[PDB]
Design an enzyme around this catalytic site. Structure first.
Site, PDB file in Angstrom:
ATOM      1  N   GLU A  35      61.312  78.312 -41.641  1.00 21.34           N
ATOM      2  CA  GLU A  35      61.336  78.304 -40.239  1.00 21.34           C
ATOM      3  C   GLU A  35      60.004  77.841 -39.720  1.00 21.34           C
ATOM      4  O   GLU A  35      60.257  77.208 -38.465  1.00 21.34           O
ATOM      5  CB  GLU A  35      61.584  79.825 -39.741  1.00 21.34           C
ATOM      6  CG  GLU A  35      62.906  80.216 -40.274  1.00 21.34           C
ATOM      7  CD  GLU A  35      64.254  79.733 -39.425  1.00 21.34           C
ATOM      8  OE1 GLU A  35      63.898  79.136 -38.374  1.00 21.34           O
ATOM      9  OE2 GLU A  35      65.249  80.015 -39.799  1.00 21.34           O
ATOM     10  N   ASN A  46      65.572  75.023 -28.050  1.00 24.16           N
ATOM     11  CA  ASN A  46      66.781  75.052 -28.360  1.00 24.16           C
ATOM     12  C   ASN A  46      67.706  74.259 -27.204  1.00 24.16           C
ATOM     13  O   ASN A  46      67.254  74.441 -25.776  1.00 24.16           O
ATOM     14  CB  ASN A  46      67.704  76.247 -28.883  1.00 24.16           C
ATOM     15  CG  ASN A  46      66.907  76.807 -29.928  1.00 24.16           C
ATOM     16  OD1 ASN A  46      67.142  76.145 -31.087  1.00 24.16           O
ATOM     17  ND2 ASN A  46      66.464  78.000 -29.928  1.00 24.16           N
ATOM     18  N   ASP A  48      70.412  75.237 -25.502  1.00 27.40           N
ATOM     19  CA  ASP A  48      70.940  76.322 -24.611  1.00 27.40           C
ATOM     20  C   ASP A  48      69.873  76.788 -23.660  1.00 27.40           C
ATOM     21  O   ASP A  48      70.306  77.629 -23.000  1.00 27.40           O
ATOM     22  CB  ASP A  48      71.599  77.406 -25.640  1.00 27.40           C
ATOM     23  CG  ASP A  48      70.486  78.424 -26.497  1.00 27.40           C
ATOM     24  OD1 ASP A  48      69.454  78.036 -26.375  1.00 27.40           O
ATOM     25  OD2 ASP A  48      71.180  79.305 -26.947  1.00 27.40           O
ATOM     26  N   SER A  50      66.968  78.365 -24.576  1.00 30.52           N
ATOM     27  CA  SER A  50      66.263  79.486 -25.350  1.00 30.52           C
ATOM     28  C   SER A  50      65.408  78.702 -26.083  1.00 30.52           C
ATOM     29  O   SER A  50      65.258  77.744 -26.476  1.00 30.52           O
ATOM     30  CB  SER A  50      67.099  80.284 -26.239  1.00 30.52           C
ATOM     31  OG  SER A  50      67.663  79.586 -27.409  1.00 30.52           O
ATOM     32  N   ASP A  52      62.700  79.664 -29.771  1.00 30.53           N
ATOM     33  CA  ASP A  52      62.349  80.435 -31.050  1.00 30.53           C
ATOM     34  C   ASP A  52      60.816  80.527 -31.021  1.00 30.53           C
ATOM     35  O   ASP A  52      60.318  79.379 -30.998  1.00 30.53           O
ATOM     36  CB  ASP A  52      62.988  79.697 -32.446  1.00 30.53           C
ATOM     37  CG  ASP A  52      64.553  79.673 -32.264  1.00 30.53           C
ATOM     38  OD1 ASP A  52      65.234  80.486 -31.676  1.00 30.53           O
ATOM     39  OD2 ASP A  52      65.136  78.627 -32.689  1.00 30.53           O
ATOM     40  N   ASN A  59      64.522  84.244 -31.512  1.00 30.97           N
ATOM     41  CA  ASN A  59      65.028  83.593 -30.401  1.00 30.97           C
ATOM     42  C   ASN A  59      65.149  84.373 -29.078  1.00 30.97           C
ATOM     43  O   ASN A  59      65.296  85.636 -29.111  1.00 30.97           O
ATOM     44  CB  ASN A  59      66.674  83.303 -30.696  1.00 30.97           C
ATOM     45  CG  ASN A  59      67.314  82.540 -29.509  1.00 30.97           C
ATOM     46  OD1 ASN A  59      67.815  82.783 -28.830  1.00 30.97           O
ATOM     47  ND2 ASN A  59      66.954  81.275 -29.751  1.00 30.97           N
TER      48      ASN A  59
END
Ligand SMILES: [Cl-]
Ligand SMILES: [Cl-]
Ligand SMILES: [Cl-]
EC number: 3.2.1.17
Length: 129
Positions: A35, A46, A48, A50, A52, A59
């Site tokens: 990750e 991301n 959308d 959002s 991380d 998220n």
């Protein structure tokens, strides 16, 4: 902070992740490697809108507030910036809520694609635990 493999394994064990909801410590170390490359300051945006955050790439749509993710649920009740600390406490406490949510560690795409069904004990091999 960029953790060493065994340093992170020891920190995660002290914070109660070894066998948390039946997931052995190697699963958590493997997830953090793929990750974030063990970097607490890792961020990724991301499609959308959002983002991380941190060593386990938590998220902003569901788990933390970053002030720029419309319809943010903030289920860990924390600013996303708290997840980038050298102290992994906030990340671990929020991860425990995520892995309890029903889908277990499948919530982490890198865990499902790169750790699940592999010899994850290899990630804690050689470590003084
Ligand atoms: Cl393990
Ligand atoms: Cl820590
Ligand atoms: Cl599970």
């Amino acid at each position: 902070k960029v953790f060493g493999r065994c340093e992170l394994a020891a920190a995660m064990k002290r914070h109660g992740l070894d066998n948390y909801r039946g997931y052995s410590l190697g699963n958590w170390v493997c997830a953090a490697k793929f990750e974030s490359n063990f970097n607490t300051q890792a961020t990724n945006r991301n499609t959308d809108g959002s983002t991380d955050y941190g060593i386990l790439q938590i998220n902003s749509r569901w788990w933390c507030n970053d002030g720029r993710t419309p319809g943010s649920r903030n289920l860990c009740n924390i600013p996303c910036s708290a997840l980038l600390s050298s102290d992994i406490t906030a990340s671990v406490n929020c991860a425990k809520k995520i892995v309890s949510d029903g889908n277990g560690m499948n919530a982490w795409v890198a865990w499902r694609n790169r750790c699940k069904g592999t010899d994850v004990q290899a990630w804690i091999r050689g470590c003084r635990l």
